[PDB]
Design a binder for this molecule. Structure first.
Ligand SMILES: CCCCCCCCCCCCC/C=C/[C@@H](O)[C@@H](N)COP(=O)(O)O
Lengths: 233, 270, 337, 219, 57, 128
């Protein structure tokens, strides 16, 4: 019964301070690196912050560095993100994402429910030249995602994560590399592509496979998501 | 300045032999460091002994080459660098022997296999050997010199003040009593533990063979004794009296022979 | 009792005569003109540290990258060979560990020892840790080898005269094999996993049919305990390492021994035997802190792997055949390429 | 290397730190292997599958193992106990009928190719029963052991003579079989003795003291 | 009685073993040699692979 | 193949002499220690005599010390034990056992219940 619950939010005047709390239950919290990911309303996802296992390495996005602070409680099970000097831009929904890194693991496995809030130049720019695909159940469809830099590494592993977000739900990890299939999803989904362009293929589409698909890189650490392709009808 | 102080103080057959001896020293200690090609890492402390001895072997050859004639060519500060390099090296050697004695004692006090990492002690001891070596070697060039207080210059070394050369003797006495006490209590803890265990091996080659290994630290006392009694009569004696100083090179070479005996009795008998 | 003993002796004599009647020439005579193999020099590519106690067993896995190692410290570790990284470190209830096995699919890992229990741990868990999946109990004696047919069935060899096949789900012995006289020390599954072999501490290697649970053949050519067995990659032969400082090669189709690998400079017994991908380099770990590479077709010694300071307890070869991992009693694993 | 490889390296470093801490914690307890016969009473010498007994003396923890429920042939699982601190060996001395077997067992475990480094702590139990049998009754060690007739001492002198004869018989095998790698520690303990733990503590103290002396090449 | 049962079990096992058919040893030797010769090119221990293809170094 | 066969037992009155021969086969006789053990009627196995690879070291049990003798012939692989003064207590089934491993000075499980390398045994009875 893996569960992540987010709390702390509401109407915050600009220039104030706020705290976001994440209570985790049902899994080994101390063995999982954690990410705070922000999704603006009517916009795509955007990585915000990351804390490692044992609070070793801490990373921040370029638009929040020096203002946000991310920490965790290991004896307890809680993840804190404290923000100071809020602007009119940080009005969005915030999720906690667990991810454990070893050989063959599945990062970005479970996403929290989310808390609402209302107030570079070198990173890889990732785009999807599609905004809506009129589909029909029982038909195969394809979604294309192009990366500015070649995500293939010298290890032979290319880092590309395909996520699905159903309407009114938290995103779920569909495919945790170029082709590796996340546990629990049906066999219909598949992924492929070269080092620069990638494609997700769905065969025998059903009613539940309607929503926004995102592609994200994991090569350079400032994590960039796609614009999101919407499959409807 | 050097001429005035030498003459206030008053001042082939041996040089070839000394050079050959120091070549032997450098060769042998370099062999100990190669002999650590097989690494299972107290070996750190012995390696520190060998590094200290290597620096001593190069430093004394520098001193032979320079001192014989070029002493009057050198400037004073370079002279202090030259003949403080030896205090650096040999104080490092003596401090590292005190450190290895401390390490042996501390290992054999406590009921534990030697496998317990005890990482902190190794670095602390090996750092506080070299730090004390450098500080004692570098005090003179800044202070405690005889450059202007001309009445009290050392006879053996005509610029180092008598106060500092007696301070060196005091430190050596402290080291030489500490080492004796530690090597005494290793043997005595064997003595005490063995009656309670009561086994046949004491009153026999457990305890009548630790004594001889201990007495080898007296062979350490041997060579450092003459040089330091000479370092002391010059704290007691006058400047032009006691004409037993111009032959101090033999005692310095005897200290180098202690440096020679250092790896024979520590790592060769392993 | 006398009549039964006489009948058994007569049957043994008849079996020996039948075996002798079908031995035209030794394999050494057949391969006397085969082009030899030059001296093979393998250097330690990787060294894996962190056990702090004697290693007793190891297993590679279907892919040739991950590895599992069991020691008497009380922990079972999983190594990433290419980068010397520790994927997992599973503590154990009992510190006396004698064997370990990696599932073909990589989902589970089995371990055993003096506790007479085979513990099966599930690696890929939703909670994010490694937890005990099953504890197969029985065997009235210490475990010495475990092998996985698949994710549901296992084979265990114990310290009594008994091997067993366990259904991991139910936990009960589906079949039990009882033909030995002493402790069963090793195990090797056939490539098709329809047969296997077991070498016991009575100088005997028996071939078991895994379906009907009965002994098919028995091979007796050694003079002391057998400590390690391994199948030929073809599946129609195997090699045994015993405690008389001698390896041997047996053939299933003609139940005799083909060649013996021993030298007058070797007096210590073998603790581990493995083959090569081509089945030509028989790698045998000895008690003299070394390993030897034998030309399996000419019985020569084509190389010595000497990098360990204590007994070479375990020795395995990857499925890809690109490495040999040897784990020794000095808490060290080494990969040779 | 990559983003997902530095994190794996950090995880491996944390695993290494946990392993080192666990090893340091487990290195401070001395492990002893208990051996004996059925009549030796090896279960009850220290006041409080594999039987495990943990006790503490002078702020030192001792862990004692007693391997039961295994087959008679013990030449293959005895190699597991190769890194133990000492082998406690409990032998009954009041039963001469099975004394020789005890001697054989001792010899077998003293000359083993793997138990050479391990020192043996002897425990000759039932000393009071041996004294009682020696005092009253007709059961003389001469018939079982012919060499007791000519033995002289080096309670009444009979009990002392018997005790020292048995100890000498056990110590001869210990003496003429080693070159200082390990020692034997013969003790005489009754069935209600309470100082066994202190004896084990002292003997372990000097066993590891001799180990430390041998490793630094100081002796 | 237990000894008699063990002896008769051993007799039955020997009788079962004695009934199998064995090929010539020369044929088995030839088959082993043929297998060793056929798959020689796919053994990266008999003939070391170039350092580019070495995964461990 | 490691079978050992003993012969020589029979009915002998007290004070008589006997000779038991164990003809080892299937292994190199010169590398292993050889022992003689015995089992009394309704009793456990008792180790009787030892011998070394060449005969340099020989040991006896206390009960029969000075009354039995043991020899090892290597040209013909045999182990002989001769009993000089038999006693009513010396009636038992005798077995010829071998150490588990070559070039080793200890025989661990020679006297165990089920030992792999041991003979069938010869029965000797004294005073009928
Ligand atoms: C921890 C304290 C340790 C102290 C150790 C002290 C060891 C001292 C060893 C000797 C060091 C000085 C060597 C110098 C010698 C000079 O007298 C000549 N080279 C001068 O020749 P000239 O120029 O006069 O012709």
């Amino acid at each position: 019964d893996v569960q992540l619950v987010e709390s702390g939010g509401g109407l915050v005047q600009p220039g104030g301070s706020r705290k976001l709390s994440c209570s985790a239950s049902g899994f080994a919290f101390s063995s999982f690196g954690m990410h705070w990911v922000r999704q603006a309303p009517e916009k795509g996802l955007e990585w915000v912050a990351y804390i490692s296992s044992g609070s070793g390495t801490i990373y921040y996005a370029d638009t929040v560095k020096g203002r946000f602070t991310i920490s965790r409680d290991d004896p307890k099970n809680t993840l804190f993100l404290q923000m100071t000097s809020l602007r009119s831009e940080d009005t969005a929904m915030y999720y906690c994402v667990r991810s454990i890194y070893y050989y063959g693991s599945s990062p970005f496995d479970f996403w929290g429910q989310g808390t609402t809030l209302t107030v570079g130049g070198s990173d890889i720019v990732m785009t999807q030249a599609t905004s809506s695909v009129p589909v029909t159940p029982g038909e195969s469809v394809s979604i294309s995602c192009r990366s500015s830099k070649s995500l293939l590494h010298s290890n032979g592993n290319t880092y590309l994560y395909w996520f699905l977000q159903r309407p009114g739900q938290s995103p779920q990890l569909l495919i945790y590399r170029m082709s590796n299939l996340a546990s629990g999803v049906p066999d219909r989904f598949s992924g492929s592509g070269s080092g620069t362009a990638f494609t997700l293929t769905i065969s025998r589409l059903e009613a539940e496979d309607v929503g926004v698909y995102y592609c994200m890189q994991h090569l350079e650490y400032p994590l960039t998501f796609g614009a999101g392709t919407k499959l409807e009808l | 300045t050097l001429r005035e102080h030498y003459q206030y103080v008053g001042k082939t057959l041996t040089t070839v032999l000394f050079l050959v001896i120091c070549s032997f020293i450098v060769l042998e200690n370099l062999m100990v460091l190669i002999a650590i090609w097989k690494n299972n890492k107290m070996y750190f402390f012995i390696g520190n002994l060998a590094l200290c001895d290597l620096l001593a072997g190069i430093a004394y050859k520098v001193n032979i080459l320079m001192s014989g004639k070029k002493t009057f060519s050198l400037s004073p500060t370079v002279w202090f660098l030259r003949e403080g390099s030896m205090f650096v090296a040999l104080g490092a050697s003596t401090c590292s022997l005190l450190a290895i004695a401390i390490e042996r004692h501390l290992t054999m006090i406590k009921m534990r296999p030697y496998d317990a990492n005890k990482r902190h002690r190794v670095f602390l001891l090996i750092g506080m050997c070299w730090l004390i070596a450098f500080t004692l070697g570098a005090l003179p060039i800044l202070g405690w010199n005889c450059l202007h207080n001309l009445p009290d210059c050392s006879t053996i070394l005509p610029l180092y003040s008598k106060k500092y050369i007696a301070f060196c003797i005091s430190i050596f006495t402290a080291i030489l009593v500490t080492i004796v006490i530690l090597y005494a209590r290793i043997y005595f803890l064997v003595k005490s533990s063995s009656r309670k265990v009561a086994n046949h091996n004491n009153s026999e080659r457990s305890m009548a063979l630790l004594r001889t290994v201990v007495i080898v630290v007296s062979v350490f006392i041997a060579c450092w004794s003459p040089l330091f009694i000479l370092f002391l009569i010059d704290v007691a004696c006058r400047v032009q009296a006691c004409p037993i100083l111009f032959k101090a090179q033999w005692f310095i070479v005897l200290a180098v022979l202690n440096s020679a005996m250092n790896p024979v009795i520590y790592t060769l008998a392993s | 009792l006398d009549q039964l003993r006489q009948e058994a002796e007569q049957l043994k004599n008849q079996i020996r005569d039948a075996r002798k009647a079908c031995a035209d020439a030794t394999l050494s005579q057949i391969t006397n003109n085969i082009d030899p193999v030059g001296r093979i020099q393998m250097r330690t590519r990787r060294t894996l540290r962190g056990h702090l106690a004697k290693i007793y067993a190891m297993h590679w896995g279907t892919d040739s990258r991950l590895l599992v190692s069991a020691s008497q410290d009380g922990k079972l570790i999983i190594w990433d060979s290419y980068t010397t990284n520790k994927v997992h470190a599973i503590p154990l209830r009992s510190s006396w560990v004698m064997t370990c096995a990696y599932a073909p699919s990589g989902n589970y890992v089995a371990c055993g020892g003096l506790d007479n229990i085979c513990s099966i741990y599930n690696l890929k868990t939703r909670e994010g840790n490694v937890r005990v999946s099953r504890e197969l109990a029985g065997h009235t004696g210490y475990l010495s080898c475990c092998r996985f047919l698949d994710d549901n069935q296992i084979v265990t060899s114990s310290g009594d005269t008994t091997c067993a096949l366990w259904d991991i789900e139910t936990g009960q012995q589906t079949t039990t094999f009882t033909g030995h006289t002493g402790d069963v020390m090793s195990l090797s599954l056939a490539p098709d996993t329809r047969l296997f072999v077991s070498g016991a501490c009575d100088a005997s290697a028996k071939l078991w049919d895994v379906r009907e649970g009965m002994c098919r053949q028995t091979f007796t050519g050694h003079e002391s305990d057998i400590n390690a067995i391994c199948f030929f990659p073809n599946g129609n032969a195997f090699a045994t390492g015993s405690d008389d400082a001698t390896c041997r090669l047996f053939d299933l189709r003609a139940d005799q021994e083909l060649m013996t690998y021993s030298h007058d400079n070797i007096i210590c017994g073998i603790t581990s035997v493995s083959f090569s991908k081509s089945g030509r380099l028989l790698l045998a770990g000895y008690d003299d802190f070394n390993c030897n590479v034998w030309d399996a077709l000419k019985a020569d010694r084509a190389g010595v792997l000497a990098g360990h300071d204590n007994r070479v307890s375990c020795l395995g070869v990857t499925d890809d055949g690109m490495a040999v991992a040897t784990g020794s009693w000095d808490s060290f694993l080494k990969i040779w390429n | 290397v990559s983003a997902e490889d530095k994190a794996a390296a950090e995880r491996s470093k944390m695993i290494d730190k946990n392993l080192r801490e666990d090893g340091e914690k487990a290195r401070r307890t001395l492990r002893l292997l208990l051996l004996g016969a059925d009549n030796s009473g090896k279960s009850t010498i220290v006041k409080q599958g594999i039987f495990e007994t943990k006790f503490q003396v002078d702020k030192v923890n001792f862990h004692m193992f007693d391997v039961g429920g295994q087959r008679d042939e013990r030449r293959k699982w005895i190699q597991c106990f190769n890194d133990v601190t000492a082998i406690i060996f409990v032998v009954d001395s009041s039963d001469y009928n099975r004394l020789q077997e005890a001697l054989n067992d001792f010899k077998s475990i003293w000359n083993n190719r793997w138990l050479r480094t391990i020192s043996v702590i002897l425990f000759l139990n039932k000393q009071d029963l041996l004294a009682e049998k020696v005092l009253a009754g007709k059961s003389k060690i001469e018939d079982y052991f012919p060499e007791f007739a000519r033995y002289t001492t080096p309670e009444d002198p009979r009990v002392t003579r018997a005790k020292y004869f048995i100890r000498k018989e056990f110590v001869d095998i210990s003496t003429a079989s080693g070159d200082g790698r390990h020692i034997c520690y013969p003790h005489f303990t009754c069935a209600v003795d309470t100082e066994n733990a202190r004896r084990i503590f002292n003997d372990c103290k000097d066993i590891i003291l001799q180990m430390n002396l041998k490793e630094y090449n100081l002796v | 009685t237990a000894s008699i049962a063990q002896a008769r079990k051993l007799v039955e096992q020997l009788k079962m073993e004695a009934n199998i058919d064995r090929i010539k040893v020369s044929k088995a030797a030839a088959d082993l040699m043929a297998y060793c010769e056929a798959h020689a090119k796919e053994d990266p221990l008999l003939t070391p692979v170039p350092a580019s293809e070495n995964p461990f170094r | 193949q490691v079978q050992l066969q003993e012969s020589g037992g029979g009915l002998v009155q007290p004070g008589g002499s006997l000779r038991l021969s164990c003809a080892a086969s299937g292994f190199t006789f010169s590398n292993y220690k050889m022992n003689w053990v015995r089992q009394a009627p309704g009793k456990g196995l008792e180790w009787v005599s030892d011998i070394s690879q060449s005969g340099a070291s020989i040991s006896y049990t206390g009960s029969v010390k000075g009354r039995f003798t043991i020899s090892r012939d290597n040209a013909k692989n045999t182990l002989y034990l001769q009993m000089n003064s038999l006693k009513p207590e010396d009636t038992a089934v005798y077995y010829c056992a071998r150490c588990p491993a070559p070039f080793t000075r200890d025989c661990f499980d020679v006297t165990s219940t089920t030992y792999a390398y041991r003979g069938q045994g010869t029965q000797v009875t004294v005073s009928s």
